[PDB]
């Protein structure tokens, strides 16, 4: 999953939230959209932007 992934950015505490939506896999989470984010509770602009940053930071 994205346990150590979100750890590097400091979002580890969110993991489980993106688990109840099926984004608990770096198989398709690596190509997640801003739309498919808010559903996991990640509706906030800063949070969405943060996760998008991780897509290129950690990849």
């Amino acid at each position: 999953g994205m346990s150590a992934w979100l750890r590097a950015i400091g979002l580890e505490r969110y993991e489980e939230g993106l688990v109840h939506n099926g984004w608990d896999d770096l198989e398709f989470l690596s190509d997640i959209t801003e739309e498919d984010l808010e559903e996991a509770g990640v509706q906030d602009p800063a949070h969405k932007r943060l996760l998008l940053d991780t897509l290129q930071l950690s990849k």
């Binding site: 993106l18 109840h20 939506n21 099926g22 608990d24 198989e27 398709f28 498919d36 559903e39």
Partner: protein, 65 residues
């Protein structure tokens, strides 16, 4: 195939319940509304969107002759 859809959206584990509920083929999968989704074995609010959203596309895709 239903499998490719269910696996691409990371709903892999649902295929089991899906096919068991008679929705083994796309034509039937595009029929089941939101209620069916929740009944077959979907209690997660998030999965209730991953499937529903994608279903909307499938329902429209088959309508696009």
């Amino acid at each position: 195939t239903v499998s490719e859809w269910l696996e691409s959206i990371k709903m892999q584990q649902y295929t089991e319940h899906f096919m068991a509920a008679g929705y083994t083929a796309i034509e039937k999968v595009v029929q089941m509304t939101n209620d069916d989704i929740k009944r077959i074995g979907v209690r997660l609010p998030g999965h209730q969107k991953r499937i529903a959203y994608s279903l909307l596309g499938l329902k429209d895709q088959v309508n696009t002759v």
